[PDB]
Structure formats: C-alpha cells, structure tokens
Swiss-Prot record, chain A:
Residues 110-207 form the Ig-like domain. InterPro entries: Ig-like_dom (IPR007110), Ig-like_dom_sf (IPR036179), Ig-like_fold (IPR013783), Ig/MHC_CS (IPR003006), Ig_C1-set (IPR003597), Immune_Resp_Modulators (IPR050380). The gene is IGKC. Keywords: Adaptive immunity, Cell membrane, Disease variant, Disulfide bond, Immunity, Immunoglobulin, Immunoglobulin domain, Membrane, Secreted. It is linked to Immunoglobulin kappa light chain deficiency: A disease characterized by the complete absence of immunoglobulin kappa chains. SUPFAM superfamilies: Immunoglobulin. This is Immunoglobulin kappa constant. Disulfide bonds join 131-191. It comes from Homo sapiens. Constant region of immunoglobulin light chains. Immunoglobulins, also known as antibodies, are membrane-bound or secreted glycoproteins produced by B lymphocytes. In the recognition phase of humoral immunity, the membrane-bound immunoglobulins serve as receptors which, upon binding of a specific antigen, trigger the clonal expansion and differentiation of B lymphocytes into immunoglobulins-secreting plasma cells. Secreted immunoglobulins mediate the effector phase of humoral immunity, which results in the elimination of bound antigens.
Length: 210, 215
C-alpha cells in the first residue's frame, strides 16, 4: 500500500569504495528496516528503526533518512558485503525490490572449452553440444553458435553462475540441442565468444566426424 | 529455531499445507509471519497469525487463497494455499515478529506447481575435451539432463573433489524438464592418473548414478 522503490537494482563496487542505496517510500513513513540476503539463505535483520544496526552488523553500515527517503550506505565496501539488500516498512508490511551488490574486479577473459555429444546421448537420439566460458569478469559475454559456419538461433540455452567467492569471476555454459538426425547432417560445430577482455572473438570448434 | 517443511510439488488447481515448527521461545507471545519469495521478484508479505489468540492479518492479495492456523500445544503454525496456479511456485518463509523486526526466519519451503511428471535424470559424460593437452588445464563434466522436479545433487568423487567445481543453475527446457552441468577444471597431467566420477542423486525418483568421465 506504501510502495517502496529501490535504486539501483544492480550495483557493482570495488572493495574500499563507498556505496549508497536508496529506498524511497511513496507515502511518508516513520521507520525503515533493511534486510540482507546472500544466495541461498533467508533474509537477515540488518538495520532497523532507520539506523540501529542489529547485532552482528559491522560498523561500516549506516541507515539514514526521513519520511520518503532512506539510504543504506557502506563506507568501505568489503568483499563479504556483496548480497541483495531489501528495505522494509511496517505499516503496509511492504518490501522494496532489492539492490544486488556485486564486487568489481579486473576484466578477465574467459577460457572457452567446447564438448561434443557423448555417444550415449546419441544412441538415445538427441545431441547436446556444451560450450563453457570459464572464470571471467564482467558478466556480459555473448556466445553465438554456428553450425557449418552459419549462425544458429533459438535452440541453445545458457546458465551463468553467481560470482565466485574467492576470485569474483562468473562462468557460463551454453548448450545447443539437436536431434541425432540434425546433428548428423552437419560437420563443423563452433562456439564463438565475444567479451570485453578479448581483442578478437574466440571460436572453438570440433568437426563431427573427427 | 523455526524448522519449516520439505519441498512440496503440486498440480495446478490443487492445495497444499506446509508447517513451520517453533522451538525455544514461547510460541503464544509472538506473531508468526509468512513471506513469499519468487525468483526475479522480491519478498511479498502473505500474512501473520497471533497463536495466543488466533487473530490474523492477511495481505489483500491472498485473502481467498491462504489460510493461517496455529496448533498451539504443538508449537506449529501452518498455512494452506488453495487453487495453486503457476505463479505460486516460490519459496515461502515463516519468520517470527519480535516487535519491530523479524528476527528469526525458517529456512524456506519450495513449492513447485506443475502439470509435469517425475522424471529421473539421464547422466552423460562431458569428456575432457578442449585444452586437454595443449593448455595445461583441462575441463571435464557431467550433463544431468531431463529431470523433474528440482533438486538434483551432483558431486565429484564422492566429495573428495571440491576445487574448481562449477555446478550451474538448472535451466528449464521447453518440455518442462530441467537440465544442468557440473564441470570441473583439472591440470592436464592428472588425466592419466586419476579417474573422475561425478555422482548424481535425484531423490524424487530415487535415482543415484555415478559416471566415470574418461578422456
């Protein structure tokens, strides 16, 4: 009923930087609370009554604000602070959308591996070709499949990991699925990767017979 | 301690009842809250119950749908949801209201709503290909394909191998069946001397398979 809007929704920050995330209350509200959630845990009490940090919340976090705008500022960003931060209010019991905070680190270009279908998958009539972009930063990577050096659309899916804990890199897999019939009509299967840390796009290929 | 219930699978139209059991504190003095979390969305408040009196506060959005009871002598708050549609697939938390903050929270109960049927996974070796020789680092993996429901548990060498393992989030294919990959990075040299086995266990099917991934 009171609608809370958080900005930014994603934010990357280097350790030692100072971050500030907003949570704006559409109708003036007395107290704001803030929960933190890391992947695969429940929300934890972080700030309450606009600025009292709970017990465990390190000195660097800091609530502030009045009426319609509250803020959570971290003074010296640490690597352990990367998580999603939700603000909360007690009259409508509403929550805001979250501000995910990731740690910035240096551009690191993906190593690309490519894997052909196992024989076992082929006997069961389907063929999945996997392309793996291993340990990279930023998360933005573009992976295009080409079969007999012609581009493919609509039959691949990718999954990305969440930022590694001691390293800060992502990994992405892209799978191309074909029927055994279709797999067998073509010869050159190639995975083309574009990414910031690459002066030219890497292509990794195998030929169906060989 | 607030110990919530197990993963719950359900078909559209159906209903489900999930517990939240409390330990430690005095169950009747504290309102118990129920919050919904759906991937790609934030936390949504469903409602709360005061078990000392059973008065309840519901969000309007869930009024005809959720019902909150509390069997007081057993310290268990419950919640059934009715007419499950695809949009109730989500993680449901109960948390204790201490007064001005939710202080404890239970681990979550995942509900999956779908017409789809249980299917154990086919496991396929993603054999040490690329850089295997000329690289110094080789990558190997298992492709865990066409299973329903989540979750599957992949591990390498019965837990003896952790370093370098990247198990990726399951993706849901057009067929409404999931697939994932667990990939491990090893030094090219180890390929002649070690044997790499991945271990996949999907409990809702009682599927446990081990696969050697030889180059």
């Amino acid at each position: 009923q009171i609608v809370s809007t958080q900005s930014p929704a994603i934010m990357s920050a280097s350790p030692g930087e100072k971050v500030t995330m907003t949570c704006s209350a559409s109708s003036s509200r007395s107290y704001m609370q803030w929960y933190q959630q890391k992947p695969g845990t429940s929300p934890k009490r972080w700030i309450y009554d606009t600025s009292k940090l709970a017990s465990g919340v390190p000195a660097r976090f800091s609530g502030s604000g009045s009426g319609t705008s509250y803020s959570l500022t971290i003074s010296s960003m640490e690597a352990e602070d990367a998580a999603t931060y939700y603000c909360h209010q007690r009259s409508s019991y509403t929550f805001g959308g979250g501000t995910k905070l990731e740690i910035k680190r240096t551009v690191a270009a993906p190593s690309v591996f490519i894997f052909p279908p196992s024989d076992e998958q082929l006997k069961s009539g389907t063929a999945s070709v996997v392309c793996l972009l291993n340990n990279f930063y930023p998360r933005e990577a573009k992976v295009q499949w080409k079969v007999d050096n012609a581009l493919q659309s609509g039959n691949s899916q990718e999954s990305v990991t969440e930022q590694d804990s001691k390293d800060s890199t992502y990994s992405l897999s892209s799978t191309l699925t074909l029927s055994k019939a279709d797999y067998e009509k073509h010869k050159v299967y190639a995975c083309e990767v574009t990414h910031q840390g690459l002066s030219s796009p890497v292509t990794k290929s195998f030929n169906r017979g060989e | 301690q607030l110990q919530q219930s197990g993963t719950v699978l359900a078909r559209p139209g159906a209903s489900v009842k999930m517990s939240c059991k409390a330990s430690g504190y005095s169950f009747t003095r504290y309102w118990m809250h129920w919050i919904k979390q759906r991937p790609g969305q934030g936390l949504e408040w469903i409602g709360a119950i005061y078990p000392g009196n059973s008065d309840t506060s519901y969000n309007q959005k869930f009024e005809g749908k959720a019902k909150l009871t509390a069997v007081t002598s057993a310290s268990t708050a419950y919640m059934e949801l009715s007419s499950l549609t695809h949009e109730d697939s989500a993680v449901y938390y109960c948390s204790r209201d201490y007064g001005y903050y939710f202080d404890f929270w239970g681990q979550g109960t995942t509900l999956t709503v779908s017409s789809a049927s249980t299917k154990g996974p086919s496991v396929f070796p993603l054999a040490p290909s690329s850089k295997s020789t000329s690289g110094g680092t080789a990558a190997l993996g298992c492709l865990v394909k066409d299973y329903f429901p989540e979750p599957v548990t992949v591990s390498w060498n019965s837990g003896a191998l952790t370093s370098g393992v990247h198990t990726f989030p399951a993706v849901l294919q057009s067929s409404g069946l999931y697939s994932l990959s667990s990939v491990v990075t090893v030094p090219s040299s180890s390929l002649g001397t070690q044997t790499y086995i991945c271990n996949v266990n999907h409990k809702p099917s009682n599927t446990k398979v081990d696969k050697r991934v030889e180059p």
